[PDB]
Amino acid sequence: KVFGRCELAAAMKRHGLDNYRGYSLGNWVCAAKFESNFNTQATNRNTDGSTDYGILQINSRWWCNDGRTPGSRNLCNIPCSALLSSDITASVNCAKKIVSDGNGMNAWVAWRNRCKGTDVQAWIRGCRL
Ligand SMILES: CC(=O)N[C@@H]1[C@@H](O)[C@H](O)[C@@H](CO)O[C@@H]1O
Ligand SMILES: [Cl-]
Ligand SMILES: [Cl-]
Ligand SMILES: [Cl-]
Ligand SMILES: [Cl-]
Ligand code: NA
């Protein structure tokens, strides 16, 4: 599923991402924009053999199991395919654990390089949130 901008912000708010760990809703929408272009089916292979999955491009090296990342962890206790569904519950729950482990939203390369220090509020502007 390819979310609309305001559609994704509502779903992120309903699951409790707004101001989670201090990051306003515009940060999460901006991150999803530049990580997956709002596509829940997005995948990308990293050079070390791991794969990023879903709306927030969650890495199989630590957070999910895909059966083909030797020596990796499954800290969110889910199959990586669960991160590709049209329901973003699995992605949001796993993102809450990722963003809680000390480094905040810097675990998302696209957020650090393309959202951090910008007007992230613009990504939820006009939305009937
Ligand atoms: C939180 C998370 O898993 N972020 C990933 C990161 O692992 C990886 O370096 C990158 C590769 O494109 O995409 C995402 O930022
Ligand atoms: Cl915001
Ligand atoms: Cl594996
Ligand atoms: Cl949803
Ligand atoms: Cl932080
Ligand atoms: Na894994």
PDB file of C-alpha atoms and ligand atoms in Angstrom:
ATOM      1  CA  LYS A   1       0.000   0.000   0.000  1.00  0.00           C
ATOM      2  CA  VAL A   2       1.196   3.503  -0.892  1.00  0.00           C
ATOM      3  CA  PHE A   3      -0.067   5.815   1.843  1.00  0.00           C
ATOM      4  CA  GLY A   4      -1.136   9.349   1.279  1.00  0.00           C
ATOM      5  CA  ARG A   5       0.730  11.894   3.366  1.00  0.00           C
ATOM      6  CA  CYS A   6      -2.143  12.827   5.692  1.00  0.00           C
ATOM      7  CA  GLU A   7      -3.404   9.235   5.647  1.00  0.00           C
ATOM      8  CA  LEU A   8      -0.076   8.027   7.051  1.00  0.00           C
ATOM      9  CA  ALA A   9       0.107  10.777   9.677  1.00  0.00           C
ATOM     10  CA  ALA A  10      -3.331   9.827  11.021  1.00  0.00           C
ATOM     11  CA  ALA A  11      -2.325   6.159  11.228  1.00  0.00           C
ATOM     12  CA  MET A  12       0.933   7.090  12.971  1.00  0.00           C
ATOM     13  CA  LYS A  13      -0.981   9.254  15.454  1.00  0.00           C
ATOM     14  CA  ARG A  14      -3.549   6.530  16.173  1.00  0.00           C
ATOM     15  CA  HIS A  15      -0.771   4.074  17.057  1.00  0.00           C
ATOM     16  CA  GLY A  16       0.957   6.658  19.261  1.00  0.00           C
ATOM     17  CA  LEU A  17       3.936   7.956  17.295  1.00  0.00           C
ATOM     18  CA  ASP A  18       3.113  11.648  17.791  1.00  0.00           C
ATOM     19  CA  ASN A  19       5.759  12.999  20.208  1.00  0.00           C
ATOM     20  CA  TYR A  20       6.974   9.480  21.019  1.00  0.00           C
ATOM     21  CA  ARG A  21      10.378   9.865  22.704  1.00  0.00           C
ATOM     22  CA  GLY A  22       9.989  13.591  22.001  1.00  0.00           C
ATOM     23  CA  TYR A  23       9.781  13.386  18.190  1.00  0.00           C
ATOM     24  CA  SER A  24       6.769  15.248  16.816  1.00  0.00           C
ATOM     25  CA  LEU A  25       4.562  13.621  14.184  1.00  0.00           C
ATOM     26  CA  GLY A  26       6.207  15.593  11.377  1.00  0.00           C
ATOM     27  CA  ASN A  27       9.495  13.785  12.027  1.00  0.00           C
ATOM     28  CA  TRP A  28       7.985  10.328  11.515  1.00  0.00           C
ATOM     29  CA  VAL A  29       6.111  11.375   8.356  1.00  0.00           C
ATOM     30  CA  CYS A  30       9.270  12.965   6.942  1.00  0.00           C
ATOM     31  CA  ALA A  31      11.284   9.827   7.729  1.00  0.00           C
ATOM     32  CA  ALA A  32       8.758   7.535   6.041  1.00  0.00           C
ATOM     33  CA  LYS A  33       8.731   9.870   3.034  1.00  0.00           C
ATOM     34  CA  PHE A  34      12.471   9.637   2.427  1.00  0.00           C
ATOM     35  CA  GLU A  35      12.941   6.030   3.572  1.00  0.00           C
ATOM     36  CA  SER A  36      10.153   4.366   1.562  1.00  0.00           C
ATOM     37  CA  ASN A  37       8.239   7.096  -0.343  1.00  0.00           C
ATOM     38  CA  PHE A  38       5.186   6.030   1.726  1.00  0.00           C
ATOM     39  CA  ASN A  39       5.320   2.503   0.230  1.00  0.00           C
ATOM     40  CA  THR A  40       4.703  -0.250   2.776  1.00  0.00           C
ATOM     41  CA  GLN A  41       6.131  -2.824   0.325  1.00  0.00           C
ATOM     42  CA  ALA A  42       9.508  -1.102  -0.083  1.00  0.00           C
ATOM     43  CA  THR A  43      12.641  -3.221   0.313  1.00  0.00           C
ATOM     44  CA  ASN A  44      16.304  -2.334  -0.105  1.00  0.00           C
ATOM     45  CA  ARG A  45      19.355  -4.586   0.139  1.00  0.00           C
ATOM     46  CA  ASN A  46      22.317  -3.302   2.141  1.00  0.00           C
ATOM     47  CA  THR A  47      25.924  -4.077   1.266  1.00  0.00           C
ATOM     48  CA  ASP A  48      26.395  -6.373   4.285  1.00  0.00           C
ATOM     49  CA  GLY A  49      23.591  -8.723   3.170  1.00  0.00           C
ATOM     50  CA  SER A  50      20.863  -7.300   5.409  1.00  0.00           C
ATOM     51  CA  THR A  51      17.591  -5.858   4.100  1.00  0.00           C
ATOM     52  CA  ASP A  52      15.447  -2.870   5.079  1.00  0.00           C
ATOM     53  CA  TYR A  53      11.695  -3.472   5.114  1.00  0.00           C
ATOM     54  CA  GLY A  54       8.559  -1.403   4.985  1.00  0.00           C
ATOM     55  CA  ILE A  55       7.330   2.122   5.533  1.00  0.00           C
ATOM     56  CA  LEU A  56      10.254   2.929   7.852  1.00  0.00           C
ATOM     57  CA  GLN A  57      12.882   0.649   6.243  1.00  0.00           C
ATOM     58  CA  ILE A  58      13.568  -1.412   9.346  1.00  0.00           C
ATOM     59  CA  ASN A  59      16.830  -3.363   9.112  1.00  0.00           C
ATOM     60  CA  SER A  60      16.941  -7.148   9.483  1.00  0.00           C
ATOM     61  CA  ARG A  61      20.417  -6.962  11.038  1.00  0.00           C
ATOM     62  CA  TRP A  62      18.901  -6.194  14.451  1.00  0.00           C
ATOM     63  CA  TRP A  63      15.146  -5.817  14.379  1.00  0.00           C
ATOM     64  CA  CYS A  64      13.439  -8.555  12.343  1.00  0.00           C
ATOM     65  CA  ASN A  65      14.089 -12.044  11.003  1.00  0.00           C
ATOM     66  CA  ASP A  66      14.164 -12.762   7.278  1.00  0.00           C
ATOM     67  CA  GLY A  67      16.055 -16.073   7.395  1.00  0.00           C
ATOM     68  CA  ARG A  68      18.946 -14.797   5.265  1.00  0.00           C
ATOM     69  CA  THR A  69      20.918 -12.351   7.466  1.00  0.00           C
ATOM     70  CA  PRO A  70      23.437 -14.629   9.215  1.00  0.00           C
ATOM     71  CA  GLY A  71      24.533 -13.459  12.651  1.00  0.00           C
ATOM     72  CA  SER A  72      21.676 -10.972  13.017  1.00  0.00           C
ATOM     73  CA  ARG A  73      19.164 -10.349  15.781  1.00  0.00           C
ATOM     74  CA  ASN A  74      15.362 -10.244  15.860  1.00  0.00           C
ATOM     75  CA  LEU A  75      14.841  -7.687  18.618  1.00  0.00           C
ATOM     76  CA  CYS A  76      11.255  -6.834  17.606  1.00  0.00           C
ATOM     77  CA  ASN A  77      10.401 -10.575  17.509  1.00  0.00           C
ATOM     78  CA  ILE A  78       8.727 -10.487  14.100  1.00  0.00           C
ATOM     79  CA  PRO A  79       9.205 -11.791  10.594  1.00  0.00           C
ATOM     80  CA  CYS A  80      10.449  -8.983   8.356  1.00  0.00           C
ATOM     81  CA  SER A  81       7.502  -9.694   6.031  1.00  0.00           C
ATOM     82  CA  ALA A  82       5.168  -8.403   8.754  1.00  0.00           C
ATOM     83  CA  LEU A  83       6.800  -5.002   8.154  1.00  0.00           C
ATOM     84  CA  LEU A  84       5.457  -5.006   4.564  1.00  0.00           C
ATOM     85  CA  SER A  85       1.721  -5.259   5.270  1.00  0.00           C
ATOM     86  CA  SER A  86      -0.773  -2.486   4.586  1.00  0.00           C
ATOM     87  CA  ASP A  87      -1.240  -2.339   8.368  1.00  0.00           C
ATOM     88  CA  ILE A  88       1.605  -0.343   9.902  1.00  0.00           C
ATOM     89  CA  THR A  89       1.105  -1.662  13.435  1.00  0.00           C
ATOM     90  CA  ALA A  90       4.111  -3.984  13.262  1.00  0.00           C
ATOM     91  CA  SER A  91       6.283  -1.213  11.804  1.00  0.00           C
ATOM     92  CA  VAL A  92       5.176   1.343  14.402  1.00  0.00           C
ATOM     93  CA  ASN A  93       5.679  -1.023  17.348  1.00  0.00           C
ATOM     94  CA  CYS A  94       9.154  -1.931  16.110  1.00  0.00           C
ATOM     95  CA  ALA A  95      10.011   1.736  15.489  1.00  0.00           C
ATOM     96  CA  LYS A  96       9.139   2.480  19.116  1.00  0.00           C
ATOM     97  CA  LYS A  97      11.814  -0.002  20.224  1.00  0.00           C
ATOM     98  CA  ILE A  98      14.371   1.261  17.695  1.00  0.00           C
ATOM     99  CA  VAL A  99      13.925   4.911  18.694  1.00  0.00           C
ATOM    100  CA  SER A 100      14.138   3.977  22.398  1.00  0.00           C
ATOM    101  CA  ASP A 101      17.566   2.304  22.339  1.00  0.00           C
ATOM    102  CA  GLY A 102      19.611   5.449  22.951  1.00  0.00           C
ATOM    103  CA  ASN A 103      20.290   7.048  19.569  1.00  0.00           C
ATOM    104  CA  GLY A 104      16.796   8.433  18.954  1.00  0.00           C
ATOM    105  CA  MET A 105      15.799   8.811  15.315  1.00  0.00           C
ATOM    106  CA  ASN A 106      19.432   8.836  14.119  1.00  0.00           C
ATOM    107  CA  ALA A 107      18.971   5.100  13.537  1.00  0.00           C
ATOM    108  CA  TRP A 108      17.149   6.211  10.355  1.00  0.00           C
ATOM    109  CA  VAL A 109      19.761   7.431   7.869  1.00  0.00           C
ATOM    110  CA  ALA A 110      17.196   9.305   5.767  1.00  0.00           C
ATOM    111  CA  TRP A 111      15.868  11.213   8.792  1.00  0.00           C
ATOM    112  CA  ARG A 112      19.342  12.243   9.953  1.00  0.00           C
ATOM    113  CA  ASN A 113      20.364  13.440   6.484  1.00  0.00           C
ATOM    114  CA  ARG A 114      17.063  14.843   5.160  1.00  0.00           C
ATOM    115  CA  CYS A 115      14.714  15.673   8.086  1.00  0.00           C
ATOM    116  CA  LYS A 116      16.931  16.575  11.046  1.00  0.00           C
ATOM    117  CA  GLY A 117      17.188  20.353  11.264  1.00  0.00           C
ATOM    118  CA  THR A 118      14.381  21.030   8.760  1.00  0.00           C
ATOM    119  CA  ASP A 119      10.768  22.203   9.104  1.00  0.00           C
ATOM    120  CA  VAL A 120       9.353  18.729   9.673  1.00  0.00           C
ATOM    121  CA  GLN A 121       6.028  20.310  10.682  1.00  0.00           C
ATOM    122  CA  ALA A 122       5.413  20.984   6.978  1.00  0.00           C
ATOM    123  CA  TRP A 123       4.851  17.241   6.481  1.00  0.00           C
ATOM    124  CA  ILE A 124       1.676  17.305   8.603  1.00  0.00           C
ATOM    125  CA  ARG A 125       0.481  20.729   7.426  1.00  0.00           C
ATOM    126  CA  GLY A 126      -3.102  20.844   6.186  1.00  0.00           C
ATOM    127  CA  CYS A 127      -3.872  17.370   7.528  1.00  0.00           C
ATOM    128  CA  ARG A 128      -7.101  16.893   9.484  1.00  0.00           C
ATOM    129  CA  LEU A 129      -5.088  14.879  11.976  1.00  0.00           C
TER     130      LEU A 129
HETATM  131  C1  LIG B   1      16.141   2.049  11.824  1.00  0.00           C
HETATM  132  C2  LIG B   1      16.703   1.338  10.618  1.00  0.00           C
HETATM  133  O1  LIG B   1      16.670   0.119  10.543  1.00  0.00           O
HETATM  134  N1  LIG B   1      17.229   2.149   9.671  1.00  0.00           N
HETATM  135  C3  LIG B   1      17.824   1.748   8.416  1.00  0.00           C
HETATM  136  C4  LIG B   1      19.341   1.494   8.541  1.00  0.00           C
HETATM  137  O2  LIG B   1      19.471   0.286   9.248  1.00  0.00           O
HETATM  138  C5  LIG B   1      20.135   1.469   7.203  1.00  0.00           C
HETATM  139  O3  LIG B   1      21.473   1.869   7.396  1.00  0.00           O
HETATM  140  C6  LIG B   1      19.506   2.238   6.030  1.00  0.00           C
HETATM  141  C7  LIG B   1      19.880   1.625   4.681  1.00  0.00           C
HETATM  142  O4  LIG B   1      19.203   2.233   3.607  1.00  0.00           O
HETATM  143  O5  LIG B   1      18.093   2.474   6.105  1.00  0.00           O
HETATM  144  C8  LIG B   1      17.493   2.768   7.327  1.00  0.00           C
HETATM  145  O6  LIG B   1      17.884   4.039   7.802  1.00  0.00           O
HETATM  146 CL    CL B   2       5.589  18.089  13.621  1.00  0.00          CL
HETATM  147 CL    CL B   3      18.555 -14.575   9.478  1.00  0.00          CL
HETATM  148 CL    CL B   4      -2.761   1.095   9.219  1.00  0.00          CL
HETATM  149 CL    CL B   5      16.394  11.645  21.387  1.00  0.00          CL
HETATM  150 NA    NA B   6      17.428 -10.545  11.669  1.00  0.00          NA
END
